[PDB]
Amino acid sequence: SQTQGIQQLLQAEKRAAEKVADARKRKARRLKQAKEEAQMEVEQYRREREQEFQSKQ
Amino acid sequence: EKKEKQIEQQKKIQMSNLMNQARLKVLRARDDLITDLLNEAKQRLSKVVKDTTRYQ
Structure with missing residues (x-):
């Protein structure tokens, strides 16, 4: 009865912590994602700039 | 850069x-070119040496 309600208090706190953990995992995933788009764009800059260099040469 | x-x-x-x-x-x-001219000049001098009277 009441102890079941207290179990529900604990479980609601648990799933709130699960939401927090999921949000933190989303943040880490987002930062890793940003890392590879950064890699892609810098690769693109290198390509544009080496085609410019061969053009100049 | x-x-x-x-x-x-x-x-x-x-x-x-x-x-x-x-x-x-x-x-x-x-x-x-100028050294060639000088070589020609010395050859002309060698030719001039041959004549005995003016050489004397």
Whole structure:
């Protein structure tokens, strides 16, 4: 009865912590994602700039 | 910026070099021509030596 309600208090706190953990995992995933788009764009800059260099040469 | 500046600088040095060797070629050609003239002159002198009277 009441102890079941207290179990529900604990479980609601648990799933709130699960939401927090999921949000933190989303943040880490987002930062890793940003890392590879950064890699892609810098690769693109290198390509544009080496085609410019061969053009100049 | 580093690589671009290096490349253009080397281009300038190469151009200045090429101009220099052009000038050097023309000048050495001048030298060769004048030395040829001198060689002809000494040959003429050798010819002049042959005649006995004016040589005396």
